[PDB]
Design a protein around this nucleic acid. Structure first.
Ligand SMILES: [Mg+2]
Ligand SMILES: [Mg+2]
Ligand SMILES: [Mg+2]
Ligand SMILES: [Mg+2]
Ligand SMILES: [Mg+2]
Ligand SMILES: [Mg+2]
Ligand SMILES: [Mg+2]
Ligand SMILES: [Mg+2]
Ligand SMILES: [Mg+2]
Ligand SMILES: [Mg+2]
Ligand SMILES: [Mg+2]
Ligand SMILES: [Mg+2]
Ligand SMILES: [Zn+2]
Lengths: 177, 66, 82, 114, 101
RNA sequence: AGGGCUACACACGUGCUACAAUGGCGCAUACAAAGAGAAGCGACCUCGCGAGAGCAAGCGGACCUCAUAAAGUGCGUCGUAGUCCGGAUUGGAGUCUGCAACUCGACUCCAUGAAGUCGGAAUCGCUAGUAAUCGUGGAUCAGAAUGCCACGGUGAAUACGU
């Protein structure tokens, strides 16, 4: 919410002045943040998914979509349709809340945070960063932790290119080493 | 969103040691009081400037004898 | 651990080297043999390479290892397994 | 009889029961009952409710189960994230402070493998 | 004792008893509590450690006075158990005898 | 100069510590012997929960110190628990020696409180101030013993016989 208002006025203002745009609609929004945990050990510990799911539920307040193996992959000993992961999509007020929480609490709390990347865009201005420790998030109690499973995060933006993606994120004060 | 499947998501205050206190509607369960923040962090405001209040100070500076 | 009435310890040559590094240093790691020296908060951000017995293993100095000595991060006894 | 989140036993004298808190041994138990003025020759049975309550907030003046677990586990985790010698020892599952491993390392090595 | 080791211990006693009264005052200053501990102790520690290591009395092994033997030493007689028994049975050690009580 | 002799899937010897009530724990009070000391023992008093620290007399020693013996005895608690047994681990904070205690010192305080329920085949020591238990000193020693060498306190059972 707070970070959304900060966008709507200050970041939209600076982005318009920076890109020389004719329409406010032509500035990057953000679609969603999809938090993914490709557990891949559920085949070993079926329970380990409900515990990992319990953690995305913890970090972001949505029950997670427990996703299944799209097709059979024998190398990883997984068939088609087995629940080898769990994800959440955060969009809207809730996405803005989580985004604020991340940037203001967890991105500093990473182990000796030497910085984030600046190339982790698909090629149209959609960021994708992966965190190596679940503990960085405040929500975790460590009173209910099995292991130190990290996760990744995709900031899906309506941006046109990687330049607009970087512009939008840096505008939000992303560390961006 | 749906009901009776999502955790509790009330409004919680998180206060860091440098005076950065942030209001965030979050899912923790009770008040929070953290140490680092997006402000009181080296790489976030001053990467070659910042100060700390821990193993670089308590453990060493408090006992320092120079 | 070393008494407080004597404070911490660091070899004088190493101290001179690290203070040179944090006063005008942008060049090269510090190849030292003083495994017995307590880390300073000055060297935080340095890449001292401390003698493990046969070589010098580089160690990027982090502010979570302050009251620690240069020999906690150099291993002396390699052991694959039985 | 419900201090700190645990189920401190009755029929034990004051100290003998208060030892049960993960963070409260004999000395800290005597100190808790000292600040609480509670005699150590009585159980946690015949203590009025207010006695249990003052014991509660003095136990909370001290450190308790969840926070002790968290602090010591995070100390160990800081060690093993630091990657120091003691971190390596905790990782590998070997004696940490320099004890004997050729023989007599069992409480820290597990029972005998082959 | 290899001769070199003997000469080592000779030079070690020599440098210890030479650099004495300097190492000792530095130790007193470090063990001391006063002088605000700012430059007194934090400079005495440095000066002490930079004093040549040979100057410490903690590098004397107390070898046998004759055979340079590191182990089995007795300070009283200054000789290993071997040379002690040798001279004590020959009779070169005064007042010494096989006790039996 | 640093490291290793301290490395650890393992197996054996010799010991220490237990697994408890003939005990643990608090309080109160007894009774030793033999030693060692000067680049040493270090009163006292005071500070510190403690390790210890400051101060510092005395003593080359039947004089001073190390040095308060313990088990014991009285008083209570525990009530047979993996426990108020056990004190291994591990964390945190220190003290002392030494230039320096990370690999790799010893102690101290707090908390953490594992194995362990008297131990298979087999195997060991001891015929009396002995075994068994309790404690103290030395040498080596800057610091570093559960080892070794000494010393005392209680103090048994049994030996038909070959
Ligand atoms: Mg307890
Ligand atoms: Mg020596
Ligand atoms: Mg010789
Ligand atoms: Mg060995
Ligand atoms: Mg065995
Ligand atoms: Mg015992
Ligand atoms: Mg004498
Ligand atoms: Mg047990
Ligand atoms: Mg237990
Ligand atoms: Mg006989
Ligand atoms: Mg005896
Ligand atoms: Mg009889
Ligand atoms: Zn801050």
């Amino acid at each position: 919410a707070k970070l959304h208002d900060y966008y709507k006025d200050e970041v939209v203002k600076k982005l318009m002045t920076e890109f020389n745009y004719n329409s406010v609609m032509q500035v990057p929004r953000v679609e969603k943040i999809t938090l993914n945990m490709g557990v891949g050990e559920a085949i070993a510990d079926k329970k380990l998914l409900d515990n990992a799911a319990a953690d995305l539920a913890a970090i972001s307040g949505q029950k997670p979509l427990i996703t299944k193996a799209r097709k059979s992959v024998a190398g990883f000993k997984i068939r088609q349709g087995y629940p080898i992961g769990c994800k959440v999509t955060l969009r809207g007020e809730r996405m803005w809340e989580f985004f604020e929480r991340l940037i203001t609490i967890a991105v500093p709390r990473i182990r000796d945070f030497r910085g984030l990347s600046a190339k982790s865009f698909d090629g149209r201005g959609n960021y994708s960063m992966g965190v190596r420790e679940q503990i960085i998030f405040p929500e975790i109690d460590y009173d209910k932790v099995d292991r130190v499973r990290g996760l990744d995060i995709t900031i899906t933006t309506t941006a046109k290119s990687d330049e607009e993606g970087r512009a939008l994120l840096a505008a939000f004060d992303f560390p961006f080493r | 969103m749906k009901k009776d499947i999502h955790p509790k998501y009330e409004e919680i205050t998180a206060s860091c040691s440098c005076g950065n206190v942030m209001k965030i509607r979050s899912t923790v369960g009770h008040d929070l009081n953290l140490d680092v923040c997006s402000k009181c962090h080296p790489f976030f405001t001053g990467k070659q400037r910042d100060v700390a209040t821990g193993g670089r100070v308590d453990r060493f500076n408090k006992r320092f004898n120079i | 651990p070393r008494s407080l009435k004597k404070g911490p310890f660091i070899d004088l040559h190493l101290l001179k080297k690290v203070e040179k590094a944090v006063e005008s240093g942008d060049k090269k790691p510090l190849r030292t043999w003083s495994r017995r020296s307590t880390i300073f908060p000055n060297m935080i951000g340095l890449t001292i390479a401390v003698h493990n017995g046969r070589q010098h293993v580089p160690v990027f100095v982090t502010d979570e290892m302050v009251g620690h000595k240069l020999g906690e991060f150099a291993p002396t006894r390699t052991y694959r397994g039985h | 009889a419900r201090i700190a989140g645990i189920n401190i036993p009755d029929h034990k004298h004051a100290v003998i029961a208060l030892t049960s808190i993960y963070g409260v041994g004999k000395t800290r138990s005597k100190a808790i009952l000292a600040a609480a003025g509670i005699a150590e020759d009585v159980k946690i049975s015949e203590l009025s409710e207010g006695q249990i309550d003052t014991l509660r907030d003095e136990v909370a003046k001290f450190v308790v189960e969840g926070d002790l677990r968290r602090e010591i586990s995070m100390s160990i985790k800081r060690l093993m994230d630091l990657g120091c010698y003691r971190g390596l020892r905790h990782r590998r599952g070997l004696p940490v402070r320099g004890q004997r491993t050729k023989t007599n390392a069992r409480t820290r090595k597990g029972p005998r493998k082959p | 004792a290899k001769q070199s080791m003997k000469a080592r211990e000779v030079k070690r006693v020599a440098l210890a008893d030479k650099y004495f009264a300097k190492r000792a005052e530095l130790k007193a200053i470090i063990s001391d509590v006063n002088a605000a501990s700012d430059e007194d102790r934090w400079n005495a520690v440095l000066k002490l450690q930079t004093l040549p290591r040979d100057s410490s009395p903690s590098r004397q092994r107390n070898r046998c006075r004759q055979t340079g033997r590191p182990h089995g030493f007795l300070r009283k007689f200054g000789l290993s158990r071997i040379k002690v028994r040798e001279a004590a049975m020959r009779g070169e050690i005064p007042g010494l005898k096989k006790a039996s009580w």
